[PDB]
PDB file of all heavy atoms in Angstrom:
ATOM      1  N   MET V 131      -2.512  18.508 -25.637  1.00 22.80           N
ATOM      2  CA  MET V 131      -3.955  18.598 -25.948  1.00 22.80           C
ATOM      3  C   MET V 131      -4.535  19.850 -25.079  1.00 22.80           C
ATOM      4  O   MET V 131      -5.760  19.993 -25.104  1.00 22.80           O
ATOM      5  CB  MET V 131      -4.726  17.327 -25.359  1.00 22.80           C
ATOM      6  CG  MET V 131      -4.297  16.115 -26.188  1.00 22.80           C
ATOM      7  SD  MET V 131      -4.744  16.213 -27.961  1.00 22.80           S
ATOM      8  CE  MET V 131      -6.492  15.807 -27.831  1.00 22.80           C
ATOM      9  N   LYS V 132      -3.634  20.667 -24.503  1.00 21.73           N
ATOM     10  CA  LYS V 132      -4.127  21.769 -23.733  1.00 21.73           C
ATOM     11  C   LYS V 132      -5.180  21.464 -22.611  1.00 21.73           C
ATOM     12  O   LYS V 132      -6.035  22.260 -22.358  1.00 21.73           O
ATOM     13  CB  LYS V 132      -4.611  22.829 -24.651  1.00 21.73           C
ATOM     14  CG  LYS V 132      -3.629  23.502 -25.468  1.00 21.73           C
ATOM     15  CD  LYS V 132      -4.308  24.320 -26.636  1.00 21.73           C
ATOM     16  CE  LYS V 132      -3.403  25.092 -27.515  1.00 21.73           C
ATOM     17  NZ  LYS V 132      -4.110  25.529 -28.718  1.00 21.73           N
ATOM     18  N   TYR V 133      -4.989  20.355 -22.006  1.00 22.02           N
ATOM     19  CA  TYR V 133      -5.805  20.003 -20.802  1.00 22.02           C
ATOM     20  C   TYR V 133      -7.243  20.074 -21.000  1.00 22.02           C
ATOM     21  O   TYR V 133      -8.085  20.361 -20.216  1.00 22.02           O
ATOM     22  CB  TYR V 133      -5.439  20.805 -19.468  1.00 22.02           C
ATOM     23  CG  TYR V 133      -3.888  20.762 -19.258  1.00 22.02           C
ATOM     24  CD1 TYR V 133      -2.996  21.736 -19.817  1.00 22.02           C
ATOM     25  CD2 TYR V 133      -3.375  19.696 -18.542  1.00 22.02           C
ATOM     26  CE1 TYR V 133      -1.657  21.711 -19.613  1.00 22.02           C
ATOM     27  CE2 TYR V 133      -1.905  19.644 -18.383  1.00 22.02           C
ATOM     28  CZ  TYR V 133      -1.115  20.586 -18.834  1.00 22.02           C
ATOM     29  OH  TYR V 133       0.187  20.540 -18.696  1.00 22.02           O
ATOM     30  N   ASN V 134      -7.706  19.624 -22.300  1.00 22.31           N
ATOM     31  CA  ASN V 134      -9.049  19.632 -22.667  1.00 22.31           C
ATOM     32  C   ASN V 134      -9.766  18.443 -22.114  1.00 22.31           C
ATOM     33  O   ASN V 134      -9.143  17.587 -21.637  1.00 22.31           O
ATOM     34  CB  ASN V 134      -9.281  19.976 -24.239  1.00 22.31           C
ATOM     35  CG  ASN V 134      -9.033  18.698 -25.004  1.00 22.31           C
ATOM     36  OD1 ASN V 134      -8.921  17.587 -24.606  1.00 22.31           O
ATOM     37  ND2 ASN V 134      -8.916  18.762 -26.383  1.00 22.31           N
ATOM     38  N   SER V 135     -11.129  18.535 -22.108  1.00 20.53           N
ATOM     39  CA  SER V 135     -11.919  17.510 -21.534  1.00 20.53           C
ATOM     40  C   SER V 135     -11.780  16.059 -22.163  1.00 20.53           C
ATOM     41  O   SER V 135     -11.920  15.106 -21.627  1.00 20.53           O
ATOM     42  CB  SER V 135     -13.395  17.870 -21.458  1.00 20.53           C
ATOM     43  OG  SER V 135     -13.947  17.977 -22.850  1.00 20.53           O
ATOM     44  N   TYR V 136     -11.478  16.085 -23.562  1.00 22.11           N
ATOM     45  CA  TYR V 136     -11.353  14.863 -24.242  1.00 22.11           C
ATOM     46  C   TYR V 136     -10.096  14.176 -23.743  1.00 22.11           C
ATOM     47  O   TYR V 136      -9.987  13.038 -23.365  1.00 22.11           O
ATOM     48  CB  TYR V 136     -11.343  15.057 -25.773  1.00 22.11           C
ATOM     49  CG  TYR V 136     -10.873  13.755 -26.457  1.00 22.11           C
ATOM     50  CD1 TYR V 136     -11.756  12.713 -26.636  1.00 22.11           C
ATOM     51  CD2 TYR V 136      -9.573  13.590 -26.980  1.00 22.11           C
ATOM     52  CE1 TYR V 136     -11.305  11.508 -27.367  1.00 22.11           C
ATOM     53  CE2 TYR V 136      -9.149  12.482 -27.551  1.00 22.11           C
ATOM     54  CZ  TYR V 136     -10.029  11.374 -27.739  1.00 22.11           C
ATOM     55  OH  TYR V 136      -9.609  10.200 -28.385  1.00 22.11           O
ATOM     56  N   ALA V 137      -9.017  14.999 -23.550  1.00 23.78           N
ATOM     57  CA  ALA V 137      -7.707  14.456 -23.199  1.00 23.78           C
ATOM     58  C   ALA V 137      -7.813  13.879 -21.823  1.00 23.78           C
ATOM     59  O   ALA V 137      -7.271  12.850 -21.469  1.00 23.78           O
ATOM     60  CB  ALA V 137      -6.567  15.572 -23.178  1.00 23.78           C
ATOM     61  N   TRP V 138      -8.564  14.668 -20.925  1.00 25.36           N
ATOM     62  CA  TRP V 138      -8.802  14.200 -19.565  1.00 25.36           C
ATOM     63  C   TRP V 138      -9.526  12.887 -19.498  1.00 25.36           C
ATOM     64  O   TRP V 138      -9.272  12.081 -18.631  1.00 25.36           O
ATOM     65  CB  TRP V 138      -9.327  15.294 -18.713  1.00 25.36           C
ATOM     66  CG  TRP V 138      -8.428  16.255 -18.068  1.00 25.36           C
ATOM     67  CD1 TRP V 138      -8.241  17.567 -18.292  1.00 25.36           C
ATOM     68  CD2 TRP V 138      -7.529  15.906 -16.879  1.00 25.36           C
ATOM     69  NE1 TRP V 138      -7.311  18.124 -17.602  1.00 25.36           N
ATOM     70  CE2 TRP V 138      -6.732  17.180 -16.660  1.00 25.36           C
ATOM     71  CE3 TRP V 138      -7.151  14.934 -16.256  1.00 25.36           C
ATOM     72  CZ2 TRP V 138      -5.814  17.248 -15.680  1.00 25.36           C
ATOM     73  CZ3 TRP V 138      -6.191  14.930 -15.196  1.00 25.36           C
ATOM     74  CH2 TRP V 138      -5.410  16.141 -14.927  1.00 25.36           C
ATOM     75  N   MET V 139     -10.426  12.660 -20.351  1.00 25.59           N
ATOM     76  CA  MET V 139     -11.286  11.368 -20.347  1.00 25.59           C
ATOM     77  C   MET V 139     -10.380  10.316 -20.860  1.00 25.59           C
ATOM     78  O   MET V 139     -10.547   9.187 -20.339  1.00 25.59           O
ATOM     79  CB  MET V 139     -12.356  11.569 -21.351  1.00 25.59           C
ATOM     80  CG  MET V 139     -13.609  12.353 -20.808  1.00 25.59           C
ATOM     81  SD  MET V 139     -14.237  11.873 -19.154  1.00 25.59           S
ATOM     82  CE  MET V 139     -14.510  13.498 -18.412  1.00 25.59           C
ATOM     83  N   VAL V 140      -9.405  10.603 -21.684  1.00 28.13           N
ATOM     84  CA  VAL V 140      -8.402   9.586 -22.205  1.00 28.13           C
ATOM     85  C   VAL V 140      -7.528   9.285 -21.038  1.00 28.13           C
ATOM     86  O   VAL V 140      -7.376   8.166 -20.630  1.00 28.13           O
ATOM     87  CB  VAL V 140      -7.613  10.123 -23.362  1.00 28.13           C
ATOM     88  CG1 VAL V 140      -6.535   9.038 -23.691  1.00 28.13           C
ATOM     89  CG2 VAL V 140      -8.542  10.147 -24.631  1.00 28.13           C
ATOM     90  N   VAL V 141      -7.029  10.267 -20.316  1.00 28.01           N
ATOM     91  CA  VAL V 141      -6.115  10.051 -19.230  1.00 28.01           C
ATOM     92  C   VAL V 141      -6.807   9.332 -17.988  1.00 28.01           C
ATOM     93  O   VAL V 141      -6.133   8.414 -17.350  1.00 28.01           O
ATOM     94  CB  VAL V 141      -5.393  11.345 -18.834  1.00 28.01           C
ATOM     95  CG1 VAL V 141      -4.568  11.095 -17.461  1.00 28.01           C
ATOM     96  CG2 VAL V 141      -4.423  11.762 -19.934  1.00 28.01           C
ATOM     97  N   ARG V 142      -7.959   9.754 -17.668  1.00 27.55           N
ATOM     98  CA  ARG V 142      -8.685   9.151 -16.601  1.00 27.55           C
ATOM     99  C   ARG V 142      -8.693   7.679 -16.889  1.00 27.55           C
ATOM    100  O   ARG V 142      -8.510   6.812 -15.956  1.00 27.55           O
ATOM    101  CB  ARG V 142     -10.097   9.640 -16.579  1.00 27.55           C
ATOM    102  CG  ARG V 142     -11.027   8.851 -15.618  1.00 27.55           C
ATOM    103  CD  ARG V 142     -12.406   9.634 -15.568  1.00 27.55           C
ATOM    104  NE  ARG V 142     -13.384   9.022 -14.733  1.00 27.55           N
ATOM    105  CZ  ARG V 142     -14.539   8.508 -15.233  1.00 27.55           C
ATOM    106  NH1 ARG V 142     -14.833   8.510 -16.533  1.00 27.55           N
ATOM    107  NH2 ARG V 142     -15.458   7.951 -14.292  1.00 27.55           N
ATOM    108  N   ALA V 143      -9.066   7.264 -18.136  1.00 28.48           N
ATOM    109  CA  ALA V 143      -9.127   5.853 -18.414  1.00 28.48           C
ATOM    110  C   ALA V 143      -7.829   5.084 -18.323  1.00 28.48           C
ATOM    111  O   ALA V 143      -7.905   3.931 -18.011  1.00 28.48           O
ATOM    112  CB  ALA V 143      -9.796   5.684 -19.798  1.00 28.48           C
ATOM    113  N   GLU V 144      -6.694   5.763 -18.632  1.00 26.47           N
ATOM    114  CA  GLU V 144      -5.403   5.170 -18.503  1.00 26.47           C
ATOM    115  C   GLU V 144      -4.965   5.006 -17.129  1.00 26.47           C
ATOM    116  O   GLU V 144      -4.250   3.920 -16.791  1.00 26.47           O
ATOM    117  CB  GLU V 144      -4.384   6.225 -19.153  1.00 26.47           C
ATOM    118  CG  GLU V 144      -2.996   5.667 -19.356  1.00 26.47           C
ATOM    119  CD  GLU V 144      -2.799   4.431 -20.339  1.00 26.47           C
ATOM    120  OE1 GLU V 144      -3.806   4.243 -21.149  1.00 26.47           O
ATOM    121  OE2 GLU V 144      -1.809   3.824 -20.320  1.00 26.47           O
TER     122      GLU V 144
END
Side-chain angles (χ1 to χ4, degrees):
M131 299 296 281
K132 290 168 176 164
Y133 308 91
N134 75 12
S135 65
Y136 170 77
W138 272 111
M139 283 307 137
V140 173
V141 171
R142 169 172 179 246
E144 187 68 14

